[PDB]
Scaffold this motif. Structure first.
Motif, short mmCIF file in Angstrom:
data_model
loop_
_atom_site.label_atom_id
_atom_site.label_comp_id
_atom_site.label_asym_id
_atom_site.label_seq_id
_atom_site.Cartn_x
_atom_site.Cartn_y
_atom_site.Cartn_z
N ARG A 64 0.82 -1.20 0.00
CA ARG A 64 0.00 0.00 0.00
C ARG A 64 0.86 1.25 0.00
O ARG A 64 0.56 2.22 -0.71
CB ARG A 64 -0.92 -0.02 1.22
N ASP B 164 1.55 11.20 -7.63
CA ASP B 164 1.44 12.12 -8.76
C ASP B 164 0.03 12.10 -9.34
O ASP B 164 -0.57 13.15 -9.61
CB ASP B 164 2.46 11.74 -9.83
N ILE B 165 -0.53 10.90 -9.53
CA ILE B 165 -1.86 10.78 -10.12
C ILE B 165 -2.90 11.43 -9.22
O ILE B 165 -3.78 12.17 -9.69
CB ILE B 165 -2.19 9.30 -10.40
N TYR C 167 -7.29 18.44 -10.58
CA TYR C 167 -6.88 19.70 -11.17
C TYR C 167 -7.43 19.84 -12.59
O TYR C 167 -6.79 19.40 -13.55
CB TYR C 167 -5.35 19.82 -11.18
N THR C 168 -8.60 20.45 -12.72
CA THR C 168 -9.20 20.69 -14.03
C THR C 168 -8.41 21.81 -14.70
O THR C 168 -8.68 23.00 -14.52
CB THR C 168 -10.68 21.05 -13.89
N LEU C 169 -7.41 21.41 -15.48
CA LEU C 169 -6.38 22.34 -15.95
C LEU C 169 -6.96 23.47 -16.81
O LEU C 169 -6.50 24.61 -16.72
CB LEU C 169 -5.30 21.56 -16.70
N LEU C 170 -7.95 23.17 -17.64
CA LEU C 170 -8.59 24.24 -18.41
C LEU C 170 -9.22 25.27 -17.47
O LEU C 170 -9.23 26.47 -17.77
CB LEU C 170 -9.63 23.68 -19.37
N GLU D 130 -0.20 25.13 -15.44
CA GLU D 130 0.91 25.51 -16.31
C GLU D 130 2.10 26.01 -15.49
O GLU D 130 3.19 25.45 -15.57
CB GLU D 130 0.46 26.59 -17.30
N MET D 131 1.88 27.06 -14.70
CA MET D 131 2.93 27.61 -13.85
C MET D 131 4.13 28.04 -14.69
O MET D 131 4.03 28.96 -15.51
CB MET D 131 3.37 26.58 -12.80
N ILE E 44 6.01 10.04 -29.74
CA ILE E 44 6.68 10.41 -30.98
C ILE E 44 7.86 9.49 -31.24
O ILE E 44 8.95 9.94 -31.60
CB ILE E 44 7.13 11.88 -30.94
N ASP E 45 7.64 8.19 -31.05
CA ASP E 45 8.70 7.20 -31.25
C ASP E 45 8.06 5.90 -31.71
O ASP E 45 7.24 5.32 -31.00
CB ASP E 45 9.49 6.98 -29.96
N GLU E 46 8.44 5.45 -32.91
CA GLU E 46 7.91 4.19 -33.42
C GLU E 46 8.31 3.02 -32.53
O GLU E 46 7.49 2.16 -32.20
CB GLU E 46 8.40 3.96 -34.86
N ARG F 299 -12.84 -0.46 0.80
CA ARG F 299 -13.47 0.34 -0.23
C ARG F 299 -14.99 0.28 -0.07
O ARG F 299 -15.54 -0.73 0.35
CB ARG F 299 -13.05 -0.15 -1.62
N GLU F 300 -15.66 1.38 -0.40
CA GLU F 300 -17.11 1.44 -0.32
C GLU F 300 -17.64 2.28 -1.47
O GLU F 300 -17.10 3.35 -1.76
CB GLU F 300 -17.58 2.01 1.03
N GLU F 301 -18.69 1.78 -2.12
CA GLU F 301 -19.30 2.48 -3.24
C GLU F 301 -20.57 1.77 -3.69
O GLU F 301 -21.24 1.12 -2.89
CB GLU F 301 -18.31 2.60 -4.40
#
Lengths: 157, 160, 135, 111, 55, 56
Positions: free
Chosen positions: A22, A31-32, A38-41, A47-48, A123-125, A149-151
């Motif tokens: 855990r 990070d996630i 954070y709704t970036l729009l 951006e910062m 951008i890499d094959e 967990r609960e939901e």
């Protein structure tokens, strides 16, 4: 003799191992989770993770030596300081007249304080793929992280 | 009998003799229903408090808390951590279904009244097994009566 | 019964998807992405499979992972933008522009998600500020 | 077993000869009582399961697990039991087709 | 070494779909003494349609 | 130890003991197999990369 005497209740199996899993998952997903809501729009700061404390102490020093300016100003100044002291190519005797001049020429004491900031900053094959088929993912059927967990009507006429 | 607990062992020094009572019973290790029920009510009230607090904290109840309540509660606390919990949340009338199974499966079920998945495991006997070994006189005392020592294996640790 | 059977015979899938082959491909692409985190095609394929079959949230999480593990990948960023709901698709899109300035496809997706004249004007003004020489 | 089956057949034929033992008045009395109770409870009749029911896959998984549970492996299962195990595995593999079959049967099958 | 037995090629067509082509693998049996390498070729067809797991 | 001086495994040691005890040994085929195995071991212990390199 009573009945319950000598009865015992077990302990969670692999408690510490599940705790370690855990902990690793949370420090990897930090990070996630940090960037989750954070709704970036609709967020102007996007951006910062222990580089963030170094960035924060840099920002605190800049705030002390700059005079409580907006967050954009603080971020720009921090980027300037870190990038210039990293791209100086270990040229040090020239750093005073530039950085301390920018910050107000406080003193060589704060010069030796701030050199620590540039010291602690750091951008890499793709054709050709390997695969491995394994019968992994074997557990005890319990939660991978030790978490909880609960939901018309009838009618008679 | 006190005679049965005598056991010998030989090494280069020579032969040495040793000893170690009554067999344990099941009831001493089964927990009473009254205690079960009272502790269930108490533990589940405690868990409800903890769950409200953790929802306030915005985390999930971790295994570290609810560790003193591991095997407690008529719906055992252990069942709160199973993988299949969300799926099980849709199994209704399972007790009646289990009871009626007798009209479909020929084998007689002794646990016709509970399901391991929902109620949890209501008992425990590892202590009983260990106490049985101890009372019978330790692994060595037990092994004395068998033919193990005739096999001449150095130890009983790597055998199968 | 007749109407419901008609609805069922309408529902029957005309493409389906051999469940066993789907699982085999899922395992193959899982191995792919695990072995090579820096392959934008790996994440794109995994998300495409998980969206064509199964549910979309797992593909979405896989693609948030893939966007960050394959920075400088317009195709993966666009996969993330299209898979995410519009509101957070915009966040994905602007994360994509942050990682890759001058990303015209990503900015176009931003505008198409915004679907409002004022926001489109502001975003395009910022894009022109970035790169004025784009016809 | 044979004697009990003989007696049960006697029972069925006696029923078919003597008609329903519950008179029409008793039937209507119990029926009216039931409808009154359901109206009081404000009960909403259970609908035929929709095509796109949210939980249909959950229910199918539970049903298949319950069917599997009845096999305490002795390593010697007869033809019919092994065939039912195969069918259960097939339903596990392809849930949607089994659901289509189930709904078809529930709508049309009567023999 | 049997890590090279199963390898695939993932080639993109930017419009319509993306294809993965199982390519031939190799089992390497290397002798450190005489340096003899028996590399056994694993054809794609062996596992392209096998309908089997890693078992 | 056997007459040739090789350390004897307990199984064949008891084999020889039982042979001497009963008064009858093994068959000709078994003797031949045993001897061929011994000389196989000797030949193996007394000692294709170049061939592969040349053929490549």
């Amino acid at each position: 003799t009573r009945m319950g005497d000598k009865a015992q209740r077990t302990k969670p199996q692999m408690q510490e191992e599940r705790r370690a899993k855990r902990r690793k998952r949370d420090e990897d997903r930090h990070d996630i989770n940090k960037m989750k809501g954070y709704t970036l729009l609709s967020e102007g700061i996007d951006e910062m993770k222990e580089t963030r404390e170094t960035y924060e102490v840099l920002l605190s020093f800049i705030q002390a030596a700059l005079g409580d300016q907006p967050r954009d100003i603080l971020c720009g100044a921090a980027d300037e300081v870190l990038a210039v002291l990293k791209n100086e190519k270990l040229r040090d005797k020239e750093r005073r007249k530039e950085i301390d001049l920018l910050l107000g020429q406080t003193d060589d004491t704060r010069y030796h304080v701030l050199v620590n900031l540039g010291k602690k900053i750091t951008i890499d094959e793709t054709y050709g793929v390997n695969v491995q088929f394994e019968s992994d993912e074997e557990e005890g059927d319990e939660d991978v992280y030790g978490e909880v967990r609960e939901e018309c009507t009838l009618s008679a006429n | 009998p006190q005679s049965d607990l005598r056991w010998s062992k030989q090494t280069d020094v020579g032969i040495t003799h040793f000893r170690s009572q009554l067999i344990p019973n099941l009831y001493r290790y089964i927990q009473p229903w009254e205690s079960e029920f009272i502790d269930s009510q108490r533990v589940w009230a405690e868990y409800a408090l903890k769950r409200q607090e953790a929802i306030a904290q915005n985390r999930r109840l971790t295994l570290e808390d609810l560790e003193d309540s591991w095997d407690r509660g008529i719906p055992r606390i252990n069942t709160l951590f199973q993988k299949d919990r969300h799926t099980l949340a849709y199994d209704k009338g399972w007790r009646v279904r289990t009871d009626f199974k007798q009209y479909q499966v020929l084998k007689q079920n002794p646990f016709w009244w509970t399901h391991q998945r929902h109620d949890g495991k209501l008992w425990n006997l590892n202590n009983y097994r260990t106490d049985m070994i101890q009372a019978l006189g330790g692994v060595e005392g037990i092994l004395e009566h068998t033919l193990f020592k005739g096999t001449y294996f150095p130890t009983w640790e790597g055998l199968f | 019964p007749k109407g419901y059977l008609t609805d069922l015979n309408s529902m029957i899938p005309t493409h389906g998807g051999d469940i066993n082959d789907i699982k085999k491909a899922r395992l193959l692409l899982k191995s792919v992405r695990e072995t090579n985190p820096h392959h934008p095609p790996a994440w794109i394929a995994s998300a495409r499979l998980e969206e064509v079959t199964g549910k979309l949230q797992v593909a979405r999480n896989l693609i948030m992972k893939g966007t960050e593990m394959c920075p400088k990948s317009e195709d993966v960023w666009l996969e993330a933008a299209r898979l995410q709901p519009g509101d957070t698709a915009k966040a994905v899109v602007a994360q994509a522009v942050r990682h890759l300035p001058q990303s015209v496809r990503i900015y176009i997706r931003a505008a198409e998600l915004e679907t409002d004249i004022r926001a489109k004007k502001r975003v395009l003004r910022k894009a022109l500020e970035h790169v004025p020489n784009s016809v | 077993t044979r004697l009990y089956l003989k007696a049960e057949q006697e029972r069925q034929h006696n029923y078919l000869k003597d008609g329903p033992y519950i008179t029409a008045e008793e039937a209507v009395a119990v029926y009216t009582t039931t409808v009154h109770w359901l109206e009081s409870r404000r009960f909403s009749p259970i609908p035929f399961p929709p095509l796109s029911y949210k939980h249909d896959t959950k229910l199918l998984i539970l049903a298949l697990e319950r069917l599997k549970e009845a096999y305490s492996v002795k390593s010697r299962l007869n033809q019919s039991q092994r065939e039912e195990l195969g069918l259960i595995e097939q339903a596990y593999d392809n849930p949607h087709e089994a659901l289509s079959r189930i709904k078809r049967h529930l709508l049309t099958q009567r023999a | 070494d049997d890590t090279n037995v199963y390898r695939v090629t993932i080639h993109k067509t930017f419009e319509g779909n993306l294809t993965t082509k199982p390519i031939n693998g190799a089992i390497f049996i290397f002798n450190p003494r005489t340096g003899q390498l028996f590399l056994k070729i694993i054809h794609t067809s062996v596992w392209a349609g096998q309908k089997r797991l890693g078992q | 130890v056997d007459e040739t001086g090789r350390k004897l495994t307990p199984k064949e040691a008891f084999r020889q003991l039982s042979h001497r005890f009963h008064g009858k040994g093994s068959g000709k085929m078994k003797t031949e197999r045993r001897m061929k195995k011994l000389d196989e071991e000797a030949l193996l212990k007394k000692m294709l990369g170049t061939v592969a390199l040349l053929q490549e």
